[PDB]
Symmetry: C2
Subunit: 101 residues, 2 copies
């Protein structure tokens, strides 16, 4: 998996975003970015791999009620099942701004 560095150049990291110019199959290049915040997590001071998002394996995300995030997500078996999570668990209103805690 991975190995982007072998066929890209001018890579850079700003905040949580990686940007790089990479070779296309038919030749030529393309510059793109990827937000890692959603991949990499801090576990007791050490950066560890998680998934890079959940939107890559889940679809039809919706706000159910006033604080429930609902979606259809893929299982290890590659099948979609219904799931939900209460955003009130960790999303707070800090003086008018939504913040994770």
């Amino acid at each position: 998996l991975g190995k982007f560095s072998q066929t890209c150049y001018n890579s850079a990291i700003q905040g949580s975003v990686l940007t790089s110019t990479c070779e296309r199959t038919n030749g030529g290049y393309n510059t793109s970015s990827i937000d890692l915040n959603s991949v990499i997590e801090n576990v007791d001071g050490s950066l560890k791999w998680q998934p890079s998002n959940f939107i890559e394996t889940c679809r039809n995300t919706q706000l159910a009620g006033s604080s429930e995030l609902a979606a259809e997500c893929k299982t290890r078996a590659q099948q979609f099942v219904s799931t939900k999570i209460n955003l009130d668990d960790h999303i707070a209103n800090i003086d008018g701004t939504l913040k994770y805690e």
Copy 2:
């Protein structure tokens, strides 16, 4: 923790982003957004809490070499330590575009 829904309204989810209009302490409101992709992960078809990013607890992120993400991250003890992770582990160049896998 959390409980944003109690003092906000007009909440909505689009993709991985939650947007809501929330009450400020001094009165009045503010509309803000938060990208959950970095919080919530899909574990075998079930949405689970992770952290919402790593940029909230890590600082001085830098690209070391051609594929290493380096940063100073907080431990459980609230102290900053040096850490790094090889982005080549999971970031690939798919026909010119950076993608997690």
